[PDB]
Design brief:
CATH superfamily: RRM (RNA recognition motif) domain
Number of strands: 6
Number of helices: 2
CATH class: Alpha Beta
Domain RRM: 6-78
Organism: Homo sapiens (Human)
Subunit structure: Homodimer.
Structural class: alpha+beta
Strand content: 25-35%
Helix content: 10-25%
Order of helices and strands: EHEEHEEE
Oligomer: monomer
CATH architecture: 2-Layer Sandwich
Largest sheet: 4 strands, antiparallel
Number of domains: 1
CATH topology: Alpha-Beta Plaits
Subcellular location: Nucleus, Nucleoplasm; Nucleus speckle
Strand order of the largest sheet: 2-3-1-6
Protein name: Splicing regulator RBM11
Radius of gyration: 12 Å
Length: 84
Amino acid sequence: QEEADRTVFVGNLEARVREEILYELFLQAGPLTKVTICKDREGKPKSFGFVCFKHPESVSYAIALLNGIRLYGRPINVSGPSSG
C-alpha cells in the first residue's frame, strides 16, 4: 500500500509522448522513483502509464498542477490512488 499511495495515473497521452517526457514533466511535483508507459500483451506501448513518486505529498501536486496540461496538444488526464 505504501507504494500505491505514491503512484499516480496519467492518460490521454499523445502518440509522441515517451517516458523521458513524462519524467521531465512530473519531476516538478517532487522526486520520482520510476515512470512507466503501459505495454500490452505483445509489448506495444499504450496511451497511458503510471508515475511513482518517492513521497505521497507529490500526489496532490501532480494532480493539481498537471491534470489537463496539453502535452503535444492533448490535455493529459492525471488521477490519483483512490478506493471506496
